[PDB]
Amino acid sequence: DTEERLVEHLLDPSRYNKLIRPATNGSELVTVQLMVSLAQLISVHEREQIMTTNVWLTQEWEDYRLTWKPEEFDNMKKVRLPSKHIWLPDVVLYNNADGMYEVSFYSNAVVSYDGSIFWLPPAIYKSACKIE
Amino acid sequence: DTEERLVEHLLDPSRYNKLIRPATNGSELVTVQLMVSLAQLISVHEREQIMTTNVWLTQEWEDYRLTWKPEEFDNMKKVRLPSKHIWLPDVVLYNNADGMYEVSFYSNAVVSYDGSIFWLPPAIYKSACKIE
Amino acid sequence: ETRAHAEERLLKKLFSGYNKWSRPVANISDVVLVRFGLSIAQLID
């Protein structure tokens, strides 16, 4: 129930417009720390030069209008927001065959009381690599 | 500016329900004239009996509740409209192999002040035909 | 006072009576000039 009052408080569409970026202090950067993690190399295809991989892409960044005081909501530190309802920077492939640019699942995202967002969606990706 | 006031006047969803047909006196007809303009013949495939062509078909019909009194809107004879929001007569293929029935672009329709609507979308079509 | 609140205010203001399908010039005998140009990424087949 207190999770419901927090999820209703955080995504008020009068309060939170998801098409802007969380800039403070006269246009600082937001820093998106990403690191990737392989799951299996599926296939290297020599004839059309496509490497099909399956990969998990951990992105984490800093937001500032998604905080609370944890005393006011009976000691939650960490909730789950439906992903793509919050802001997210679009981080895609760029050397792509077949035009699938974005990720494949759009899972949940884990919000702390800092404003730090963690995100880990999976993807299958078809990069076009040059065969020696 | 006055065109913008006209396009807010014409497609007003209290005024203009899209999926009825334009008729006024105890079920009179509408007339849809059409002709076909070819662009190229791409292929005739003989292993599976399928012809792939490129064709712009021109349809023109006559509506009655798209009318404006054109000296009130500062001598405007001819507007464009997006064709998802007006009525369409559905004109499809019927001997179609591989199952695409509608047209491929859904371009703008040109609406004159009488209500005569000109429309020309492009398509590619995979028609089926019997090779002897 | 901050940036993103002011950006949300002007993005609220600009889409008050903006209309999608109006050809956006002020006088009707004036054209727009859609400047064009490509860049190839790769040549597949």
From Swiss-Prot, chains A, B:
Highest taxon above the source species: Eukaryota
Site (Key residue for a rapid dissociation (K(off)) from the conotoxin BuIA): 110, 118
Extracellular side: 1-132
Effect of residue 48 to A: Reduces CHRNA4:CHRNB2 channel opening potentiation by divalent cations
Record localization: Synaptic cell membrane; Cell membrane
Glycosylation sites: 25
UniProt site positions, description: Key residue that may interfere with effective access of the conotoxin BuIA to the channel binding site: 58
Biological function: Component of neuronal acetylcholine receptors (nAChRs) that function as pentameric, ligand-gated cation channels with high calcium permeability among other activities. nAChRs are excitatory neurotrasnmitter receptors formed by a collection of nAChR subunits known to mediate synaptic transmission in the nervous system and the neuromuscular junction. Each nAchR subunit confers differential attributes to channel properties, including activation, deactivation and desensitization kinetics, pH sensitivity, cation permeability, and binding to allosteric modulators.
Subunit description: Neuronal AChR is a heteropentamer composed of two different types of subunits: alpha and beta. CHRNB2/Beta-2 subunit can be combined to CHRNA2/alpha-2, CHRNA3/alpha-3 or CHRNA4/alpha-4, CHRNA5/alpha-5, CHRNA6/alpha-6 and CHRNB3/beta-3 to give rise to functional receptors. CHRNA2:CHRNB2 and CHRNA4:CHRNB2 nAChR complexes exist in two subtypes: LS (low agonist sensitivity) with a (CHRNA2/4)3:(CHRNB2)2 and HS (high agonist sensitivity) with a (CHRNA2/4)2:(CHRNB2)3 stoichiometry; the subtypes differ in their subunit binding interfaces which are involved in ligand binding.
Protein family (similarity comment): Belongs to the ligand-gated ion channel (TC 1.A.9) family. Acetylcholine receptor (TC 1.A.9.1) subfamily. Beta-2/CHRNB2 sub-subfamily.
Disease per record: Epilepsy, nocturnal frontal lobe, 3: An autosomal dominant focal epilepsy characterized by nocturnal seizures with hyperkinetic automatisms and poorly organized stereotyped movements.
Protein name per Swiss-Prot or TrEMBL: Neuronal acetylcholine receptor subunit beta-2
Gene field: CHRNB2
Residues of the full protein shown: 27 to 158 of 502
Curated annotation (Swiss-Prot), chain C:
Annotated glycosylation sites: 27
Origin superkingdom: Eukaryota
Subcellular location(s) per record: Synaptic cell membrane; Cell membrane
Clinical note on disease: Epilepsy, nocturnal frontal lobe, 1: An autosomal dominant focal epilepsy characterized by nocturnal seizures with hyperkinetic automatisms and poorly organized stereotyped movements.
Similarity section: Belongs to the ligand-gated ion channel (TC 1.A.9) family. Acetylcholine receptor (TC 1.A.9.1) subfamily. Alpha-4/CHRNA4 sub-subfamily.
Role description: Component of neuronal acetylcholine receptors (nAChRs) that function as pentameric, ligand-gated cation channels with high calcium permeability among other activities. nAChRs are excitatory neurotrasnmitter receptors formed by a collection of nAChR subunits known to mediate synaptic transmission in the nervous system and the neuromuscular junction. Each nAchR subunit confers differential attributes to channel properties, including activation, deactivation and desensitization kinetics, pH sensitivity, cation permeability, and binding to allosteric modulators.
Assembly: Neuronal AChR is composed of two different types of subunits: alpha and beta. CHRNA4 forms heteropentameric neuronal acetylcholine receptors with CHRNB2 and CHRNB4, as well as CHRNA5 and CHRNB3 as accesory subunits. Found in two major stoichiometric forms, LS (low agonist sensitivity): (CHRNA4)3:(CHRNB2)2 and HS (high agonist sensitivity): (CHRNA4)2:(CHRNB2)3, the two stoichiometric forms differ in their unitary conductance, calcium permeability, ACh sensitivity and potentiation by divalent cation. Cells produce predominantly an (CHRNA4)3:(CHRNB2)2 nAChR.
Protein name: Neuronal acetylcholine receptor subunit alpha-4
Organism: Homo sapiens (Human)
Organismal lineage: Eukaryota, Metazoa, Chordata, Craniata, Vertebrata
Gene label: CHRNA4
First and last residues shown, out of full length: 31 to 75 of 627
